[PDB]
Structure 1
Amino acid sequence: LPNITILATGGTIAAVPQLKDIANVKGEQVVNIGSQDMNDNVWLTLAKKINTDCDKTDGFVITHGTDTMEETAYFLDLTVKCDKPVVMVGAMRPSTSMSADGPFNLYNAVVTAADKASANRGVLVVMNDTVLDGRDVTKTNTTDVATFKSVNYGPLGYIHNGKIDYQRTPARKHTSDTPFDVSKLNELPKVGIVYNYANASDLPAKALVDAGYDGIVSAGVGNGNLYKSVFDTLATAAKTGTAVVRSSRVPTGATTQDAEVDDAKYGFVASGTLNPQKARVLLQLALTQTKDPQQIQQIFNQY
Structure 2
Amino acid sequence: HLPNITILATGGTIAGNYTVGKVGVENLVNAVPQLKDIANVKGEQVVNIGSQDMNDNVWLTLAKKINTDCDKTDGFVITHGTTTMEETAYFLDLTVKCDKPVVMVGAMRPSTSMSADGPFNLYNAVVTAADKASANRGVLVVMNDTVLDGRDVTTTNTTDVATFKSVNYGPLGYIHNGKIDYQRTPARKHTSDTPFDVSKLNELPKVGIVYNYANASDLPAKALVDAGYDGIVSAGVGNGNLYKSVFDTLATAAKTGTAVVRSSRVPTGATTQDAEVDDAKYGFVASGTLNPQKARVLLQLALTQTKDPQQIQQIFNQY
Q: Provide TM-score, normalisation by structure 1.
A: 1.00
- Please give the per-residue CA displacement for 1:92-151, whole angstroms capped at 9, x wherever unaligned: 000000000000000000000000100100000000000000000000000000000000
The 5-angstrom pairing of residues 48-67 of structure 1 reads 48-67=64-83
Other structure's SS at 2:305 match: coil
Once residues 151 and 32 of structure 1 are traced to their aligned partners in structure 2, the CA distance between those partners, rounded to angstroms, is: 30
- Please give the per-residue CA displacement for 1:224-268, whole angstroms capped at 9, x wherever unaligned: 000000000000000001000000000000000121100000000
Once residues 180 and 212 of structure 1 are traced to their aligned partners in structure 2, the CA distance between those partners, rounded to angstroms, is: 23
Unpaired runs of at least 5, structure 1: none
Unpaired runs of at least 5, structure 2: 16-30
Once residues 198 and 63 of structure 1 are traced to their aligned partners in structure 2, the CA distance between those partners, rounded to angstroms, is: 38
Once residues 76 and 256 of structure 2 are traced to their aligned partners in structure 1, the CA distance between those partners, rounded to angstroms, is: 42
The 5-angstrom pairing of residues 148-187 of structure 1 reads 148-187=164-203
Other structure's SS at 1:132 match: strand
State the Cα distance separating 1:17 from its structure 2 match.
1.5
2:23 corresponding residue in structure 1: none
Other structure's SS at 2:304 match: coil
- Please give the per-residue CA displacement for 1:26-71, whole angstroms capped at 9, x wherever unaligned: 0000000010000000000000000000000001000000000000
Other structure's SS at 1:272 match: coil
Other structure's SS at 2:180 match: strand
1:246 corresponding residue in structure 2: 262
Structure 1 runs (4+) deviating above 3 angstroms are none
Once residues 169 and 121 of structure 1 are traced to their aligned partners in structure 2, the CA distance between those partners, rounded to angstroms, is: 6
Once residues 263 and 239 of structure 2 are traced to their aligned partners in structure 1, the CA distance between those partners, rounded to angstroms, is: 8
Once residues 267 and 73 of structure 2 are traced to their aligned partners in structure 1, the CA distance between those partners, rounded to angstroms, is: 37
Once residues 133 and 13 of structure 2 are traced to their aligned partners in structure 1, the CA distance between those partners, rounded to angstroms, is: 27
Percent identity over the alignment is 99
Judge conservation of contact 2:208–2:231 (CA < 8 Å) in 1.
yes
**Which of 273, 278, 284 lines up with 1:262 in the alignment?**
278
1:33 corresponding residue in structure 2: 49
Once residues 193 and 258 of structure 1 are traced to their aligned partners in structure 2, the CA distance between those partners, rounded to angstroms, is: 21
Is structure 2 residue 20 aligned with structure 1 residue 19? no
Once residues 186 and 118 of structure 1 are traced to their aligned partners in structure 2, the CA distance between those partners, rounded to angstroms, is: 30
Other structure's SS at 1:164 match: strand
Once residues 273 and 131 of structure 2 are traced to their aligned partners in structure 1, the CA distance between those partners, rounded to angstroms, is: 39
Once residues 284 and 156 of structure 1 are traced to their aligned partners in structure 2, the CA distance between those partners, rounded to angstroms, is: 26
Q: CA RMSD in A?
A: 0.4
Once residues 180 and 258 of structure 1 are traced to their aligned partners in structure 2, the CA distance between those partners, rounded to angstroms, is: 26
1:275 corresponding residue in structure 2: 291
1:46 corresponding residue in structure 2: 62
State the Cα distance separating 1:90 from its structure 2 match.
0.1
Other structure's SS at 1:247 match: strand
Once residues 150 and 185 of structure 2 are traced to their aligned partners in structure 1, the CA distance between those partners, rounded to angstroms, is: 12
**Which of 138, 147, 158 lines up with 2:154 in the alignment?**
138
- Please give the per-residue CA displacement for 1:247-300, whole angstroms capped at 9, x wherever unaligned: 000000000012110000000000000000000000000000000000000000
Once residues 222 and 173 of structure 1 are traced to their aligned partners in structure 2, the CA distance between those partners, rounded to angstroms, is: 27
Other structure's SS at 2:127 match: helix
Other structure's SS at 2:44 match: strand
Judge conservation of contact 2:274–2:280 (CA < 8 Å) in 1.
no
Once residues 192 and 51 of structure 2 are traced to their aligned partners in structure 1, the CA distance between those partners, rounded to angstroms, is: 26
Once residues 260 and 161 of structure 1 are traced to their aligned partners in structure 2, the CA distance between those partners, rounded to angstroms, is: 47
